Amino acid sequence: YRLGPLLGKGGFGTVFAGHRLTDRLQVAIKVIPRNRVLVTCPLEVALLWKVGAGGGHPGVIRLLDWFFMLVLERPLPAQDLFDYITEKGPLGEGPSRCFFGQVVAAIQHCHSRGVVHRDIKDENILIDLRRGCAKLIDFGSGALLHDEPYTDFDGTRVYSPPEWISRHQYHALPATVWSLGILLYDMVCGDIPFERDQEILEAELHFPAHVSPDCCALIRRCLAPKPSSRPSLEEILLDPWMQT
């Protein structure tokens, strides 16, 4: 492999653009420190291999190799939703619907593999601009799905679910749905719903004028304070806004 220009830096490590020497394929090399992250390969590798077995969702980026330096696939041209929205603004409900079902099926697959992404947000959805195809990146904070709940959260406060704020505990699915909730809101609205803890635990949603009733309805379904109240992946797919 040949590394190239930087793409982004941060707590997720450092992702460089690069290429595979033999076939000149465009790849991304994510560099992770040993004691500043979290056989005996990193969890992230373990997870991506389970996810990448057979073939991805295929809205999940695939790990090509690991050395810590993880060589993953890199669509060209690419851009993440966060930056997408920042340049274009809210997506429209047509497009949003489009990406959103993509994203849910991506996740759906991971769950079948037994992986939970645990940090679904605009930054961690990669848009292949040529194929208009959203792809789930960064399993740095993800973990193995199980019955037992999780007592650790790497996400930002504003993205956290009310049961994390409330009890420092959350189950995979209902937390995932929340995140999708936030995600959907982000796309259609052009920014996240909640800032302060009062609002998250209250689920105080004030929609702008253009969000279709049918849309709003699903967001509110997903941003239910009670975890039980929240829909499941399958049901989100049936939801009236998601059709057509």
Numbering used by the authors: 32 to 69, 78 to 106, 112 to 288
Original paper wording:
The serine/threonine kinase PIM2 is highly expressed in human leukemia and lymphomas and has been shown to positively regulate survival and proliferation of tumor cells.
Here, we describe the crystal structure of human PIM2 bound to one of these inhibitors, the (R)-enantiomer of compound 1. At the N-terminus residues Gly22 to Glu31 which are disordered in molecule A form a short helix in molecule B while the loop preceding the αC helix is disordered in molecule B (Asn66 to Val78), but partially ordered in molecule A. In addition, the tip of the adjacent β4-β5-loop is not defined in either molecule. The structure of PIM2 in complex with the (R)-enantiomer of compound 1 shows the perfect fit of the inhibitor to the ATP pocket. As designed the metal centre does not form any direct interactions with the kinase domain but plays a structural role organizing the organic ligands in the three-dimensional space. As expected, the maleimide of compound 1 establishes one hydrogen bond between the imide NH and the backbone carbonyl oxygen of Glu117.
